[PDB]
A paper describes a structure:
Aryl-fluorosulfates are mild electrophiles that are very stable in biological media and in vivo and can efficiently react with the side chains of Lys, Tyr, or His residues, when properly juxtaposed by a high-affinity ligand. We report here that a fragment library of aryl-fluorosulfates, when deployed with proper biophysical screening strategies, can identify initial covalent fragments. As a model system to define the most suitable screening approach with our library, we chose the antiapoptotic protein hMcl-1(172–323), given that we recently reported on ligand-first strategies to derive covalent peptide inhibitors targeting active site residues Lys 234, or His 252 with more reactive sulfonyl fluorides, or more recently also His 224 with an aryl-fluorosulfate peptide. The hMcl-1(172–323) construct retained its binding ability for pro-apoptotic proteins and it has been extensively studied to characterize the interaction of hMcl-1 with potential drug candidates. ,,,− Based on our previous experience with covalent agents, we observed that covalent compounds could cause very large denaturation thermal shifts, often with double-digit degrees Celsius, compared to reversible agents.
Finally, the X-ray structure of the complex between fragment hit 2 and hMcl-1(172–323) was also obtained at 1.82 Å resolution, indicating that the compound binds in a deep region within the BH3 binding pocket surrounding His 224. In addition, the contiguous electron density between the compound and His 224 Nε that corresponds to the expected imidazole sulfamate moiety can be clearly observed. Our screening approach resulted in the initial fragment hit 2 whose binding geometry as determined by X-ray crystallography is novel with respect to the several hMcl-1 antagonists reported to date, that almost invariably anchor around an electrostatic interaction with Arg 263 and an acid residue (mimicking a critical Asp acid in the BH3 peptides). The spectral data clearly indicated a large perturbation to the 15Nε and 15Nδ resonances of His 224, compatible with a covalent bond formation at the imidazole ring of His 224. Chemical shift perturbations studies mapping the changes in backbone [15N, 1H] correlations of hMcl-1(172–323) in the presence of fragment hit 2, also revealed that the compound likely binds to the BH3 binding region, closer to His 224 than other binding site nucleophilic residues His 252, or Lys 234. With fragment hit 2, accordingly, which induces the largest ΔT m, hence likely the most effective under the chosen experimental conditions, we observed nearly 100% 1:1 covalent complex formation via MS analysis. Moreover, since reference compound 6 also binds covalently to His 224, we performed a displacement measurement by TSA, and we observed that binding of the covalent hit 2 prevented the binding of the BH3 peptide.
Residue numbers in the entry: 172 to 321
Write the structure that this text describes.
């Protein structure tokens, strides 16, 4: 509920900022501090994942054939690949969000920017429904920031 709202806030803003290059300075939700720290963390670690795995991201996007809202409302397969062994950690969660940013950039390229928001929902959706129990035990997005603190 609040975990969903916060996760959606963070993932929606990262994907929009990655696709447009413009920071959304409109105010945050109730938990502004945690979400702003999580977004700053994604700007570091998420951008690096895209740089390292650009070829593999291109191949997976090519295999998924994402081009519309229906394709956007169906990020399985990525959920298979990032959690094929079924193990959950913050690095794999980051990699899922990083691929979402990679798809959002492509949606901007083919003039489908309206699909970026439903992309953030389905990624947030499959993340929270599948890993809720794990996300709560790791103290949510504060544990995310503290893990990647550096
Ligand atoms: S990397 O080494 O910087 O980050 C990283 C670490 N371990 C595994 C992965 N996995 C992936 O990038 C895979 C490959 C293609 C793809 C598409 C969507 C989600 C995940 C992945 C990366």
């Amino acid at each position: 509920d609040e975990l969903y709202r916060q996760s959606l806030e963070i993932i929606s803003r990262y994907l929009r900022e990655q696709a447009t290059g413009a920071k959304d300075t409109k105010p945050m939700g109730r938990s502004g501090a945690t979400s702003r720290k999580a977004l700053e963390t994604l700007r570091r670690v998420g951008d690096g994942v895209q740089r390292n795995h650009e070829t593999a991201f291109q191949g997976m996007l090519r295999k998924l054939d994402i081009k519309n809202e229906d394709d956007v409302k169906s990020l399985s397969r990525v959920m298979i690949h990032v959690f094929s062994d079924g193990v959950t950690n913050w690095g794999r969660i980051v990699t899922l969000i990083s691929f979402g940013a990679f798809v959002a950039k492509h949606l901007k390229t083919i003039n489908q920017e309206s699909c970026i928001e439903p992309l953030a929902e389905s990624i947030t959706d499959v993340l929270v429904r599948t890993k809720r129990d794990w996300l709560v035990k790791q103290r949510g997005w504060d544990g995310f920031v503290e893990f990647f603190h550096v």
